[PDB]
Amino acid sequence: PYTVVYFPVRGRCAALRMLLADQGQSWKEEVVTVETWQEGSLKASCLYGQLPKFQDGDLTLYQSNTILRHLGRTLGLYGKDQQEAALVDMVNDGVEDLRCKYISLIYTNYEAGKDDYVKALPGQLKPFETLLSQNQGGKTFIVGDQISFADYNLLDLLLIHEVLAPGCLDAFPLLSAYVGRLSARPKLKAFLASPEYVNLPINGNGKQ
Amino acid sequence: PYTVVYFPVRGRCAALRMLLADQGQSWKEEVVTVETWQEGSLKASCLYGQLPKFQDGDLTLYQSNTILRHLGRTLGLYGKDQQEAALVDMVNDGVEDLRCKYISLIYTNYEAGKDDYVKALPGQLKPFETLLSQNQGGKTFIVGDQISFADYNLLDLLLIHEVLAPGCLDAFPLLSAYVGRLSARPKLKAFLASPEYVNLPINGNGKQ
Ligand SMILES: C=C(CC)C(=O)c1ccc(OCC(=O)O)c(Cl)c1Cl
Ligand SMILES: C=C(CC)C(=O)c1ccc(OCC(=O)O)c(Cl)c1Cl
Ligand SMILES: [Ca+2]
Ligand SMILES: [Ca+2]
Ligand SMILES: [Ca+2]
Ligand SMILES: [Cl-]
Ligand SMILES: [Pt+2]
Numbered sequence: 001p002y003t004v005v006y007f008p009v010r011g012r013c014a015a016l017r018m019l020l021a022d023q024g025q026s027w028k029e030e031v032v033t034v035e036t037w038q039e040g041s042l043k044a045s046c047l048y049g050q051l052p053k054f055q056d057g058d059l060t061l062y063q064s065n066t067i068l069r070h071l072g073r074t075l076g077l078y079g080k081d082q083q084e085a086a087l088v089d090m091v092n093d094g095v096e097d098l099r100c101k102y103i104s105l106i107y108t109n110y111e112a113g114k115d116d117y118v119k120a121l122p123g124q125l126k127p128f129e130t131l132l133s134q135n136q137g138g139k140t141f142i143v144g145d146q147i148s149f150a151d152y153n154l155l156d157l158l159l160i161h162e163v164l165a166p167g168c169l170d171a172f173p174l175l176s177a178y179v180g181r182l183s184a185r186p187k188l189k190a191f192l193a194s195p196e197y198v199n200l201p202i203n204g205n206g207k208q
Numbered sequence: 209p210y211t212v213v214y215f216p217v218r219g220r221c222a223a224l225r226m227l228l229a230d231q232g233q234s235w236k237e238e239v240v241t242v243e244t245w246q247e248g249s250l251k252a253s254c255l256y257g258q259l260p261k262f263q264d265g266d267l268t269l270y271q272s273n274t275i276l277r278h279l280g281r282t283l284g285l286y287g288k289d290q291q292e293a294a295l296v297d298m299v300n301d302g303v304e305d306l307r308c309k310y311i312s313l314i315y316t317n318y319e320a321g322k323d324d325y326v327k328a329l330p331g332q333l334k335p336f337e338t339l340l341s342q343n344q345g346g347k348t349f350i351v352g353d354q355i356s357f358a359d360y361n362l363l364d365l366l367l368i369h370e371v372l373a374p375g376c377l378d379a380f381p382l383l384s385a386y387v388g389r390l391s392a393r394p395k396l397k398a399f400l401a402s403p404e405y406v407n408l409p410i411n412g413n414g415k416q
Contacts, residue, residue: 063301070290089277100308
């Protein structure tokens with residue numbers, strides 16, 4: 001019932017794929033080559049001229065956080081009540097902010113910008129440590145006592161940052177433990193070890 | 209029940225203010241001056257070192273779209289069902305994407321970047337005219353038959369863009385009429401005419 005339409009990269013679909021995999025949901029991958037994209041037709045049919053495109057039956061969605069929120073809603077991964085739902089959003093928006101900075105570094109300014117980025121990184125990661133500390137001493141999820149779509153997105157962000165700056169989580173014991181804990185969830189663990197995950201690059205331009 | 213903590217500018221609070229005013233809600237403005245921000249204490253206390261900060265009872269929120277979603281969820285401005293909520297998110301994420309570009313122009317590249325931004329603008333607005341075209345002929349709201357938080361956000365986006373690039377909606381009959389229709393809603397109309405809105409600059413650097 002789900003289709004993911006994307007480039008042959010992890011990128012903005014990593015988190016939503018982890019979510020689907022961990023939740024035992026089945027989906028189709030439709031792969032878009034750089035050549036098809038450059039041909040221009042598919043791009044012109046996309047609402048905002050970008051991928052991912054996501055189909056849930058006849059419901060067609062664009063925007064990676066739209067897809068996360070939609071799956072969060074329909075799969076009960078959006079907090080236990082209205083207050084938790086808002087906290088989940090606050091976490092996801094912070095994740096999205098850091099993701100945009102990471103995307104900027106990777107695609108527009110890797111060589112000149114990397115040292116500065118890594119130096120500023122602890123400052124950008126600290127709010128997630130703080131959230132964890134304020135929730136059951138960081139022993140469960142980013143919000144409340146059940147997983148949310150923000151957990152999968154946060155997890156992705158942290159995983160890609162380790163690759164960017166090995167040991168960056170050494171300064172953050174709760175985030176470190178959290179990555180280990182979520183990454184060990186059985187369906188998730190299997191997915192992250194699988195060719196369909198491992199054989200895709202993180203980004204489209206060979207940088208990580 | 210609500211408190212908005214922000215600089216004396218419209219910026220990222222404009223949409224949530226329009227929402228509150230139109231929905232007959234009461235709120236307190238806590239105005240933060242340049243001197244107070246520079247002092248550092250308030251900034252250090254903010255989850256992501258940014259304003260707005262929003263209070264509603266004992267709930268403290270940060271991130272303008274988290275605030276919009278919370279108000280949307282709690283006041284019933286988030287579509288009629290899950291499928292509509294997904295479309296609402298899709299519109300809001302698209303509004304936010306263009307807000308991000310607008311902000312980057314205003315704050316970091318106004319004199320060099322304006323000509324390229326304005327030339328690109330029609331292709332950036334067109335998706336919203338298309339959405340309107342596909343929903344009851346553009347006669348109601350951006351999604352469905354009831355107002356949503358995305359409508360308030362889109363209306364703001366459009367109003368600030370008419371200041372930036374006067375006439376930018378002229379080629380878009382549905383958006384043009386939507387702006388007039390929503391702007392005529394009695395409480396919103398009163399708010400938009402009030403000194404509280406009119407006498408604040410859109411941005412914090414004198415550019416618009
Ligand atoms: C195929 C490509 C050209 C479109 C390409 O290398 C590329 C550029 C930007 C991208 O994302 C940016 C983002 O905002 O996620 C991604 Cl995921 C890719 Cl694969
Ligand atoms: C505090 C400032 C430095 C003098 C300043 O002017 C400033 C910078 C970025 C901002 O974010 C833009 C947005 O609307 O998100 C805003 Cl709202 C302001 Cl007021
Ligand atoms: Ca986006
Ligand atoms: Ca943000
Ligand atoms: Ca309603
Ligand atoms: Cl952006
Ligand atoms: Pt951005």
